[PDB]
Design a protein around this ligand. Structure first.
Ligand code: SF4
Ligand code: F3S
Ligand code: FES
Lengths: 75, 114, 102, 279, 64, 83, 102, 217, 99, 44, 42
């Protein structure tokens, strides 16, 4: 044709189960329950962060070989 | 709320104030670190010269004169000062305010004994 | 968990007062702030030689302390009115401008 | 093996032939031009040294009736007998002389050659179809297309008379009018953009019109079966209402309208497959 | 299968116990720390600091 | 949004006194970073004690200032004690 | 082509044999069949909110006439509760830090 | 802001610091211009409305914050010497690769992709296939290599960490040069009386811990 | 699978004849393509013969698979070894597609 | 849009006809899964 | 009878709009091109 853009849902994808409508209430409940655990951790982490410097938070660095990380003056 | 221009000006002023405080802290830390490094070098040289500490590459062992070490004397003096003044230290289980009050009392007692 | 954490905690009233004082300082001690920024712009004064810009930093800090003081009666009254308006905010541009002109 | 040489030749051969897009051989040597110019596509794929060699012939227009088929016959009877062309009706009824007459797919019998001696006229085969000879295309793919459409009256049940004509009112016979006049010239199909892209997977405009005529027959009871057979893959979905079928129809038909009707029936059939199938 | 899993867990526990015994021997290898007078009156042993003195030899004065 | 950005930017500013001067603030910053000999033994105990009492930068600064003052006093005492 | 056409044909035969073996190996084949069934269930029976209400309203279950409204209400309530919880957590964190800033 | 190109360093006593200052003055203008452009873009985004701004900002303005931070870091450190990068390889290898994919220091062609594409061409000339197909296959491995090369944003974080380490090392090294003359007297005697290559900072930590461990107290 | 092999052969035949195929234009088919087409024609004849017990299945197979055979035959000229390639198809199945 | 793009590919690109509808149905499902994953990730 | 046909159409249109917004960042543009062609404050 020359105009196929329509807003109606797909006729093949608009199916329904034999036990009623599409399984959506259970799926929405599962999605909401998962979101509470998910968007409850970022809220806890973001709002309970404190930035503190006490001269002990720094630790002597070490290379991948484990030895103390020191660079010579002339490299 | 306020104008965006005023917000930008206030942000610039606050950043400048923070940078000035950082510069002051950096100067203080640089002077203190230079002094500390000089003192540590002097102490290490004195300890090695006195036959009190034997330095071996990266490990150091107590020598024959380890009893006369200035570091040992400083550790003993720090222990004595903590015992005589910071009686509740490492055992004061009070809140932040209680710990602050205890620290203030200890500092006042130390100044009185100074 | 992407936004930077807060280091020093100030109350809402303290934040509003600091914002007002910073606006006043930027409108008053802008020359001192520019001097401090220029002295703290080179690599030396930035990281290597912090003692050089000490005088300019002290001048800027004294200017900021005098600005935040609001010792004048008109300045104090205007700051109190602006703080009241900002707390009502939980607009105010006229009050802020009136405080600035003091 | 021969891949690199083939690539080099095809790249250069296309490059060396892009400028010369018309060899335009001359039948003879002449100076005075009192004759119309016709470029006849000559392609005899029987000898190895033969390819599209459209020759420029000059002949008097008044020497024959002002018809494309008549002029072609005159040129092929006197000047160049080697030319071949399929034409039997000579009246625009069989669809045999369907050719590209001056940039249009039309039957040469019902046609008129240009009288402008200055403007040369070019005649070539049906286009995107295998060329058996000069201006002779092969409708073998199209003919098999007529076999897929089942263009025969199919009766699900018989009539009680068993000795008379099928009951068909004049309006019902008029439903098949204007679609049974197609001469199967394959001119609309040859100019159909849908068939130009998917000639195998698309029946074509003429085939769609024939299928619509067979389905819309009053006596035939296989309209639903015709819709089901047609509404498979891109057999009918290839047509996009371009409209070149009706403009290139020498019979005056409306293949675009027939295709629109068939598509509306197919779309309604999909809805009817859901509206009339539930319990 | 259950016995094999239990044996693997026991072998892991034995390795952990050997490591812990080596650590405890190293800690006890330190000299005795005197706790007399105020040091005995307010011992530095704290619940949060217990990990800092596990298997560390002290000599404390007091009344049992 | 703008207020939130302003608060985030102002969060790094140490809340000093309004009546205090630049010289006093710089001296207090210098007193915090004060070089002492006996501090090395005092610093370990002070940090161990304050590790459970530090949750905010302000509290950390206060505890560190108190510890530094005590360390400076102890260093003065040690200097007066062992010539 | 050439004698290398033997190599091409052998490579084609080896690829076909490998594909057949990987396809027809019992465990992987059963797993692929199960995966195809699961994909069909997931795609063809996706939780669409709109579906065919072919049955008469006298037989339509109220769960379908309220499914869209229930889902929309659940989503809106979840969003509102998340916003309220975020605001409450921010305020509580601010208060707890101000108490602990002392 | 408009720092003069001419640096007043002595260049005869602290050459490392002089070179660092010259490099900082050299690249200050372009870095400042890029930072100003980024800041103006950020301000314009903040001035936006609803889904176009002030709602997804700065959350959706993630690629701009990192870009601004990288630009500021590059402005702070004038020029990165290749020798210093290898030292940072002691902590993190492929730092040079990350910097090249992040700082556009040179041309980055798909070398491995080109090799893979030429490899498919060998089969294309063995099992005779169209030259268009051979070119498509050669581009496809090269295209995959280009796609996997560009867009490396975690490499930007790795390069930020490397730049911070390099800045810290340069700051420490510059401080060594300034006090080199003053500390020259102690260095000779310390080397003569202390046979130890480790830093005194960790050595002092050993002596303090030993005194806290085994001392008559 | 058989119909897809036939369609792939037809698409290979059409690919070198498309107007957009400037990469490679070969007038004469390669011996590999001709041998593959001959083997496919023999397989199609054998499969159609095996479908004798089911007239409906045989007719459906001739309609579906044979369409690609007719398309390939019409796309190749009848010269040289073309009769040797189309010896199996051009007995009865050719006339089914009017050939 | 997916069906229209598939038809356009099968119309102009002759090489696009070598892939059967079973792969196309797998292609459409993969595209839908990718679109859903991208929509989730932009909001997650 | 498609239940909630308006809801389905709205969901499809919103999905298309969200996909366009997220994939193209049309609403979140970069003004660094016009940054040089601007008047600086202060
Ligand atoms: S519909 Fe018209 S153009 Fe098409 S084949 Fe029939 S007569 Fe020819
Ligand atoms: S031009 Fe094509 S769109 Fe249809 S009516 Fe004709 S077949
Ligand atoms: S001769 Fe048949 S239509 Fe031309």
């Amino acid at each position: 044709a020359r105009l196929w853009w329509t807003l109606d849902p797909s006729k093949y994808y608009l199916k329904q189960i034999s036990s009623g409508g599409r399984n959506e209430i259970l799926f929405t409940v599962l999605g909401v329950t998962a979101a509470y655990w998910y968007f409850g951790n970022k809220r806890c982490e973001h709002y309970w962060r404190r930035q503190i410097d006490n001269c002990q938070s720094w630790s002597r660095a070490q290379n991948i070989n484990g030895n103390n990380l020191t660079v010579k003056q002339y490299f | 709320m306020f104008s965006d221009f005023n917000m930008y000006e206030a942000k610039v002023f606050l950043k400048a104030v923070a940078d000035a405080q950082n510069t002051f802290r950096q100067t203080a830390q640089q002077e203190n670190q230079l002094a500390r490094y000089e003192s540590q070098s002097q102490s290490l040289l004195n300890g090695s010269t006195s036959g009190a500490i034997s330095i071996t590459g990266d490990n150091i062992q107590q020598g024959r004169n380890f009893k006369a070490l200035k570091e040992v004397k400083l550790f003993q003096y720090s222990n004595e000062i903590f015992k005589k003044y910071l009686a509740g230290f490492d055992s004061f289980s009070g809140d932040y305010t209680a710990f602050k009050k205890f620290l203030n009392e200890s500092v006042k007692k130390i100044e009185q004994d100074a | 968990s992407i936004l930077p954490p807060l280091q020093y905690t100030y109350s809402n009233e303290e934040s509003l007062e600091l914002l007002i004082h910073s606006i006043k300082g930027n409108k008053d001690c802008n020359s001192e702030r520019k001097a401090f920024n220029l002295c703290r712009s080179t690599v030396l004064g930035k990281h290597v030689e912090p003692e050089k810009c000490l005088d300019k930093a002290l001048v800027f800090v004294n200017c900021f302390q005098k600005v935040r003081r609001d010792e004048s009666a008109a300045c104090q009254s205007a700051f109190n009115s602006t703080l009241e308006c900002g707390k009502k905010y939980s607009s105010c541009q006229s009050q802020l401008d009136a405080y600035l002109n003091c | 093996s021969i891949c690199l040489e083939s690539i080099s030749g095809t790249i250069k051969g296309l490059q060396k032939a892009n400028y010369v897009v018309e060899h335009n051989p001359n039948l003879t040597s002449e100076e005075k031009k009192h004759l119309k110019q016709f470029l006849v596509y000559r392609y005899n794929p029987a000898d190895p040294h033969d390819q599209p060699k459209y020759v420029s012939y000059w002949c008097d227009i008044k020497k024959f009736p002002p018809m494309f088929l008549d002029a072609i016959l005159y040129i092929k009877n006197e000047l160049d007998p080697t030319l071949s062309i399929r034409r039997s009706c000579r009246e625009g009824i069989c669809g045999s002389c369907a050719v590209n007459c001056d940039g249009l797919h039309t039957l040469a019998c019902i046609s008129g050659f240009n009288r402008d001696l200055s403007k040369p006229t070019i005649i070539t085969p049906l286009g995107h179809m295998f060329i058996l000879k000069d201006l002779v295309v092969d409708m073998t793919n199209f003919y098999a297309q007529y076999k897929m459409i089942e263009p025969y009256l199919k009766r699900k049940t018989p009539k009680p008379d068993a000795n008379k004509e099928y009951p068909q009112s004049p309006e019902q016979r008029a439903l098949l009018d204007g679609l049974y006049e197609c001469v199967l010239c394959a001119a609309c199909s040859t100019s159909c953009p849908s068939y130009w892209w998917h000639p195998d997977r698309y029946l074509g405009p003429a085939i769609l019109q024939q299928a619509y005529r067979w389905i819309v027959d009053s006596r035939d009871e296989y309209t639903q079966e015709r819709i089901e057979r047609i509404a498979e893959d891109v057999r009918l979905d290839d047509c996009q209402q371009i409209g070149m079928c009706s403009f290139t129809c020498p019979k005056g038909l409306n293949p675009q309208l027939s295709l629109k009707n068939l598509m509306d029936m197919v779309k309604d059939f999909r809805q009817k497959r859901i509206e009339q199938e539930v319990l | 299968i259950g016995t094999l899993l239990y044996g693997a867990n026991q072998s892991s526990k034995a390795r952990e116990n050997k490591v812990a015994t080596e650590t405890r021997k190293e800690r006890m290898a330190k000299p005795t720390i005197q706790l007399t007078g105020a040091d005995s009156q307010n011992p530095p042993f704290t619940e949060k600091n217990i990990n800092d003195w596990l298997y560390k030899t002290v000599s404390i004065t007091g009344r049992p | 949004k703008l207020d939130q950005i302003i608060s985030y930017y102002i969060t790094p500013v140490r809340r000093f006194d309004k009546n205090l001067t630049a010289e006093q603030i710089y001296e207090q910053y210098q007193q915090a970073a004060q070089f002492n000999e006996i501090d090395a033994f005092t610093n370990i105990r002070f940090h161990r004690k304050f590790k459970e009492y530090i949750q905010t930068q302000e509290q950390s600064d206060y505890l560190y200032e108190k510890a530094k003052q005590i360390s400076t006093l102890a260093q003065k005492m040690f200097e007066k004690k062992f010539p | 082509n050439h004698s290398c056409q033997k190599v091409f044909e052998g490579f084609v035969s080896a690829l076909y044999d490998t594909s057949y073996f990987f396809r027809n190996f019992g465990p992987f084949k059963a797993t692929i069949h199960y995966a195809t069934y699961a994909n069909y269930l997931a795609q063809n029976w996706a939780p669409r909110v709109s579906y065919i209400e072919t049955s008469t309203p006298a037989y339509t279950l109220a769960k379908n006439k309220y499914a869209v409204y229930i889902v929309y209400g659940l989503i809106g309530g979840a969003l509102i509760h998340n916003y309220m919880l975020d605001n409450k957590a921010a305020q509580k964190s601010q208060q707890y830090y101000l108490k602990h800033r002392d | 802001v408009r720092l003069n190109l001419k640096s007043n360093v002595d260049q005869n006593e602290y050459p490392f610091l002089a070179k660092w200052d010259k490099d900082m003055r050299q690249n200050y203008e372009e870095y400042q211009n890029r930072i100003d452009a980024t800041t103006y873009h950020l301000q314009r985004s903040q001035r936006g409305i609803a889904v176009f701004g002030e709602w997804m900002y700065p959350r959706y303005f993630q690629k701009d914050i990192l870009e601004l931070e990288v630009l500021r870091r590059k402005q702070q450190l004038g020029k990165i010497y290749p020798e210093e990068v290898s030292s940072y390889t002691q902590i993190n290898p492929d730092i040079a690769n990350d910097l090249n994919l992040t700082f556009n220091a040179k041309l980055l062609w798909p070398v491995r992709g080109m090799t893979v594409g030429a490899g498919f061409f060998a089969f294309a000339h063995l099992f005779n296939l169209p030259y268009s197909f051979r070119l498509g296959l050669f581009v496809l491995p090269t295209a995959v290599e280009l796609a996997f090369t560009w867009g490396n944003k975690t490499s930007q974080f790795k390069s930020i960490e490397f730049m911070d380490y390099l800045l810290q090392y340069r700051v420490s090294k510059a401080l060594l040069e300034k006090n080199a003359k003053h500390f020259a007297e102690k260095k000779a005697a310390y080397q003569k009386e202390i046979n130890s290559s480790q830093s005194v900072q960790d050595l002092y930590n050993q002596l303090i811990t030993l005194v806290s461990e085994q001392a008559p107290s | 699978e058989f119909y897809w092999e036939l369609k792939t052969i037809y698409l290979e035949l059409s690919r070198g004849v498309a107007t957009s195929n400037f990469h490679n234009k070969r007038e004469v088919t390669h011996s590999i393509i001709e041998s593959d087409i001959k083997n496919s024609i023999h397989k199609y004849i054998q499969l159609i013969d095996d479908l004798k017990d089911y007239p409906e299945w045989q007719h459906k197979v001739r309609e579906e698979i044979g369409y690609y055979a007719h398309m390939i035959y019409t796309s190749v000229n009848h010269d040289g070894n073309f009769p040797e390639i189309f010896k199996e198809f051009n007995k009865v199945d050719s006339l089914y597609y009017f050939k | 849009m997916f069906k229209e793009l598939i038809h356009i590919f099968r119309t102009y690109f002759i090489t696009f006809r070598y892939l059967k509808k079973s792969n196309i149905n797998f292609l459409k499902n993969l595209s839908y899964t990718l679109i859903a994953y991208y929509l989730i990730i932009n909001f997650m | 009878p498609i239940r909630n046909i308006q809801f389905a159409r709205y969901h499809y249109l919103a999905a298309v709009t969200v996909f366009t917004y997220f994939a193209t960042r049309c609403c979140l543009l970069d003004y660094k091109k016009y940054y040089p062609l601007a008047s600086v404050k202060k």
